[PDB]
Every structure is written in C-alpha cells, then in structure tokens.
Paper text:
SaTrmK is typical of class-I methyltransferases, with an N-terminal domain where the cofactor binds and methyl transfer takes place and a C-terminal domain likely involved in tRNA recognition. TrmK is essential for Staphylococcus aureus survival during infection but has no homolog in mammals, making it a promising target for antibiotic development. To shed light on the structural basis for cofactor binding and help inform future structure-based inhibitor design, crystals of SaTrmK apoenzyme, and the binary complexes SaTrmK:SAM and SaTrmK:SAH were obtained, and data were collected to a resolution of 1.3, 1.4, and 1.5 Å, respectively.
DSF analysis indicated that citrate leads to an overall modest decrease in SaTrmK Tm that only becomes noticeable at high citrate concentrations, which is incompatible with the presumed tight binding required for the interaction to continue from protein expression to crystallization. This is evidenced by the crystal structure of the apoenzyme and no SAH detected by LC-MS after denaturation of SaTrmK which would have released any bound SAH. Superposition of the three structures revealed negligible effect of cofactor binding on Cα root-mean-square deviations (RMSDs), whose values were 0.15, 0.18, and 0.08 Å between SaTrmK and SaTrmK:SAM, SaTrmK and SaTrmK:SAH, and SaTrmK:SAM and SaTrmK:SAH, respectively.
Author numbering: 0 to 225
The structure:
C-alpha cells in the first residue's frame, strides 16, 4: 500500500522539486517510493552502499510496483550517478554532517547539472555548510525539528553562479536557522553546551591545554548566540 515515513523524512519530502529524486545512501528506497506514490517526483534513483540495504531496496521497489520508476544502484556516495542521469533533487539523509560533506566533496564532479540538494544532518552540520560553500551551493531553506526527543537539521541548497561566503556563525548555526532560533534551535545548542562542559569534567587542565582552548572557544561562540 502507501508507505508512511517518519516526520524527519516527510519534512525532507516537502522540499522536492518535480522530476527525479536521487536518494544517496537511501534507507531501503522508502523516500523515493514515498515521493512517487505522493506525486512529488516522477522517477527515482536509490543509491545503497552495501548489499543488505541494496537487496532490501530492490525488494521494496518491487513490492510497491515501481520497478520501471526507481532504479536501485549499489555504490558509495555519489559514485552511483551515471552521466546520462537527469536529476532534479539529490537527497542525503540520516547521516552526520561530516559524512554528507565528504560525499558531496568526493562526488563533486557528479553535480554538473546543478540539482537541488536536500540534506538531513544528524550532527555537526557545520562541515556540510563549509562544503556547500566550496561547491557554489547556496542555502535556500533550513529546518530544525525534533523526533523521538532527537534534534535533526534539514538544509536545502541550490547552485549559485557565484560562491556564497558564510560567516563562522552562519556555518556553525545556519544562515536561515539563525534568523529564527526556534525552541529546537535553543534545545539543540543548550544540549551541545552541556556536552562541551561535560568534556571539561573529564579533561585535566594541566594535561589538555590545546584541546581545552578549542572547547572553551566553542562554548563562548555558542553562549554568545544563545
């Protein structure tokens, strides 16, 4: 029947443009299946990095009668993208910011048709914003939201004919999310402060001068924005 997604991925789906979705490291092709069942996209590519998710995606596409509309591919990151593909959206979800960043940078040659990027980061989204900036991408929307008590960020970006430089605060906190600072922004960064002060409970100041200087600088950045 109709697939139901979690709220994190449902929220991602609301940023899809019409056409093709390429879901990278897909969670068993459910986001592409949902997108087609709901008429958000026409066609899909589901990239799966290892055999288990690959085999599951193949079975799920077949079970939903979408074998002619979603192409399930085995490969890491953007390695699955083929030269003849027409891709309107690349989605990369359920990963840390640093991994999404690495996928985009390592795969940058696959971005020539300038698709919309919809990235859903679990942690440390700074790295992905730094990479987007390097790739002539511009953040056009951001969401911060909570599901099952965990806070997730969604970053929506499109290609710009000039590189868009972000400040240190915009990279760390988000150029859109800074404009709003919703209850989930405050909760996320309160939690991150608690984690940084907790690290200070574990590191002797005589033995960790360099590392503690970095932690204290980061605390001061967050305390200024809250």
């Amino acid at each position: 029947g109709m697939i139901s997604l979690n709220n994190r991925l449902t929220t991602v789906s609301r940023f899809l443009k019409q056409g093709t979705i390429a879901d990278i490291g897909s969670d068993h092709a459910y986001l592409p299946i949902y997108a087609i069942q709901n008429h958000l996209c026409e066609c899909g590519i589901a990239g799966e990095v290892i055999q288990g998710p690959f085999q599951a995606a193949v079975k799920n596409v077949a079970a939903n009668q979408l074998v002619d509309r979603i192409d399930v591919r085995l490969g890491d990151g953007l390695s699955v993208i083929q030269p003849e593909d027409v891709i309107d959206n690349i989605t990369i979800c359920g990963m840390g910011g640093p991994l999404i960043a690495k996928i985009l940078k390592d795969g940058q040659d696959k971005l020539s048709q300038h698709p919309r990027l919809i990235l859903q980061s679990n942690i440390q989204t700074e790295n992905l914003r730094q990479t987007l900036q390097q790739l002539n991408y511009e953040i056009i929307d951001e969401i911060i939201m909570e599901e099952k008590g965990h806070i997730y960020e969604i970053v929506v970006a499109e290609y710009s004919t000039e590189l868009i430089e972000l400040s240190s605060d915009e990279l760390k906190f988000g150029p859109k999310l800074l404009n709003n600072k919703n209850e989930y922004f405050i909760k996320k960064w309160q939690r991150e402060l608690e984690a940084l002060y907790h690290i200070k409970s574990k590191l002797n100041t005589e033995q960790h001068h360099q590392r503690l200087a970095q932690i204290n600088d980061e605390i001061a950045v967050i305390e200024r924005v809250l």
